[PDB]
Design a binder for this molecule. Structure first.
Ligand SMILES: [Cl-]
Ligand SMILES: [Cl-]
Lengths: 286, 286
């Protein structure tokens, strides 16, 4: 097995959204019968590839087709200004990409914003989803115990307005439990993605100005989900409180929640092996 | 491979406790470099064999020696009236058995009272334990959200006082999320273990009368634990509140918590397959 590469799996497709046509980027990996979509977080400089670099190969080696969608406003995809539901917007784009590639069912691994988007997608088109895996996100709403805006979201919002190296370091320093895990390659890739697309950073800020609540609260509709769901969270997540994971657990019947204590807001990376093993086990369930 | 039988693995050993010598029973299954000790709950009629019937074989087949200890006051072991710390009494007994069996290290799977016991043991003899797995128990203390005595505990205490088939069904009815799980076989074996040793039932009530707080609150000392720990819980556990699992999680560094939503107080049984998978993976980590 030869590890996958970004350039080799890179692809584009057009999607119709609100009367306008936008070019959307995504990485297509492997060819398996079952497909697994990975939706990135909302950090500045984030892309499907950089977010899931440590989880792509275990999925392909296992025989899954892996697609990492870069939501508009991030990566090589066109930028956009969202004044409505960010969650539903991305879900719409994924829907188009999925229909065009003629893919019937998909498993979802949503990270942070990706989690909200996966729940939105599953809520809208349940018949098009197999299993759902949520990490650090999934539903909008208030935390019962942690102050908001959270310590992390403040640094993320600040970085977006002032895309400096210092703010990138300020944000990432509390993004993961053990910063010794952050690599220079990782850091440099984000920074490069940040500075290479200032149109994204500017539109993200504008989206917040146009609509402060980018993510709907799907709480009351969680009873609708029939997909076998697995929720993953870090106990020390400083961006999205852990009790959000508890809410998702209480709302989705038959779900399970796995919490890593020594972990921040990026479990798929901080505890990659434990994570990839949980996911593969989960995805293999009947 | 032939499934393990309670009759074939049955064994006894003598342990010195409080100046007296009590006959302790336990089932010794399989062979393997590493040994996994399983500690049963505190329900009337409970035994190591009955509690872990769905976990013994996958454990043995994975290549572990499995010891199921029936703590004094339960099963074929001698009875006892405990006015001190239950968790510590049990850990002493295990310490004796493990020294007598010449076993250097042990992995632990503690169920409810068993979890409290595994933590007591790990706190006293950290050098003798490998990995720590706690299910529905581990530390005394108050719940932050659920009323105590809990709905489940009131029925467990009622059963001990008045050992009737009606009260056994009543306890079990809220012991698991899906009562369709309970088998006539499981029930009958429970009834037998209960009515068989009325001395145990009587001594449990006497112990409670002698000492209302059978389990010490290990919260302040949880930071002493260095064992890689895995905590498992049922969101709908009506005997021991799930936030107790959260406490273990926050207090034990490097630990992980896995919660089953549609699960009561007996996850090892209710979600046997997924539980065994979680444990085997866990036990296999370096
Ligand atoms: Cl991100
Ligand atoms: Cl029990």
């Amino acid at each position: 097995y030869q590890p996958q590469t970004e350039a080799a799996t890179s692809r584009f497709l057009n999607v119709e959204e609100a009367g306008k046509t936008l070019r959307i980027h995504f990485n297509d990996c492997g060819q398996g019968d079952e497909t697994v979509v990975l939706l990135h977080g909302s950090g500045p400089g984030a892309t499907g590839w950089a977010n899931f670099s440590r989880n792509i190969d275990p999925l392909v080696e296992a025989g899954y087709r892996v697609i990492l969608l870069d939501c508009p406003g991030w990566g090589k995809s066109d930028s956009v200004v969202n004044s409505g539901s960010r969650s539903d917007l991305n879900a719409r784009i994924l829907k188009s990409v999925v229909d065009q590639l003629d893919i019937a069912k998909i498993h979802l691994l949503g990270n942070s914003m990706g989690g909200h988007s996966s729940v939105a997608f599953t809520l809208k088109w349940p018949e098009r989803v197999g299993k759902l895996v949520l990490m650090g996100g999934g539903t909008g709403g208030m935390s019962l115990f942690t102050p908001m805006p959270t310590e992390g979201i403040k640094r993320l919002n600040q970085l977006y307005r002032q895309p400096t190296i210092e703010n990138l370091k300020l944000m990432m320093d509390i993004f993961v439990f053990d910063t010794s895990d952050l690599t220079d390659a990782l850091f440099e890739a984000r920074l490069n993605n940040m500075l290479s697309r200032r149109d994204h950073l500017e539109n993200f800020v504008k989206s917040l100005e146009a609509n402060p609540k980018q993510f709907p609260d799907f709480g009351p509709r969680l009873a609708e989900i029939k997909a076998q769901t697995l929720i993953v969270w870090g106990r020390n997540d400083r961006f999205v409180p852990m009790d959000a994971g508890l809410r998702l657990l209480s709302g989705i019947a038959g779900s399970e929640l796995h919490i890593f204590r020594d972990c921040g807001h990026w479990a798929q990376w901080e505890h990659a092996d434990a994570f990839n093993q949980l996911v593969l086990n989960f995805l293999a369930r009947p």
